[PDB]
C-alpha cells in the first residue's frame, strides 16, 4: 500500500502548503496528496 | 541528475525555504538538495 507519486508541476508555494498540511494533518495526508495528484495534473 | 533525494524528516517551514531556494536558484538545485539533506540525515 502507498504509491509513489511524482508531482513536479506544482508551484513552490503549493508544495509549501501541501507539505505543511501533511505534517499538520497527517491523518488527512491521503487526501492532501490526492489533491496534489490533481494539482500537478492541472498544471501539467 | 536522476537521483532520489528524500527529505521527509524536514519540517514544512524548513523545506519550504529549500523549495523556494530551488525556484530562486535552480542552478544550485542539486547542491541545495544535498544541503537540505544534511538536516534530513541529522533528523534521520
Amino acid at each position: 500500500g502507498g504509491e509513489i507519486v511524482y508531482l513536479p508541476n506544482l508551484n513552490p508555494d503549493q508544495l509549501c502548503a501541501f507539505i505543511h498540511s501533511i505534517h499538520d494533518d497527517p491523518s488527512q495526508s491521503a487526501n492532501l496528496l490526492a489533491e496534489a495528484k490533481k494539482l500537478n495534473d492541472a498544471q501539467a | 541528475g536522476g537521483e532520489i533525494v528524500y527529505l521527509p524528516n524536514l519540517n514544512p517551514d524548513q523545506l519550504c525555504a529549500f523549495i523556494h531556494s530551488i525556484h530562486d536558484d535552480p542552478s544550485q538545485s542539486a547542491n541545495l538538495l544535498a544541503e537540505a539533506k544534511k538536516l534530513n540525515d541529522a533528523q534521520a
Binding site: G1, G2, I4, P8 | -
Partner: peptide
C-alpha cells in the same frame, strides 16, 4: 538547468528526485 521532481510515497514520506535528462 536542473530541477527536482517532487515524489512522495503516499503513506508517510515525501521526498525529492532530480530531473534534467
Amino acid at each position: 538547468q536542473r530541477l527536482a521532481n517532487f515524489l512522495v510515497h503516499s503513506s508517510n514520506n515525501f521526498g525529492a528526485i532530480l530531473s534534467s535528462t
